[PDB]
Amino acid sequence: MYKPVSLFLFFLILAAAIHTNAVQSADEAISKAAVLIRQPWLNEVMTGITHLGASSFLLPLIVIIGAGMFFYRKTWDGLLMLLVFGTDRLLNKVLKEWIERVRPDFAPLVHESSFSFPSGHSMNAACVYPVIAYFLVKHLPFLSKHKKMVYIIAGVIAVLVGISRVYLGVHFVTDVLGGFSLGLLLFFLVKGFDEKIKRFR
Question: Which loops or segments lie on the Extracellular side of the membrane, by the record?
Fold first, then answer.
């Protein structure tokens, strides 16, 4: 499928491009430009939003949803969601420790110690929220007339989490795009897998 291949190729192009001075310069300018629109009230809003992409929030979220699905439909798809989440975290950690990009460190509003590329919160969100959308639409019949709106919400949440990492001064735009592309890649792989094994269309 062209979608997952294209996201993979895009990530590779980014992983090369962040080593050019021209991209590094644009990344710094956008990071610093984001500081210009900060207000203390918005700092708080953006910090709350960023928690929607944190592993400590998404793991219990996945378990609660998976449990709800089991009680409602007797499905075990919750384990599939946990599996993709675990793969997402392992992949992000390996890539971070291999690329070793230094954090922006101009004006961070939340503290993070690790390397910055790819962004963990962006990768978490771009994978988990679309995956939740897929399994909720799969299993909750009363959502089948709101399919598009469910996916729109997932996409809005993911985009806002990414924005918040740049706003909050702990990731560059390119860290966020790299994370987005790989999280979406993993969503499409799980979705393609689950649709494949269906015995009825």
Answer: 18-55, 100-119, 168-172
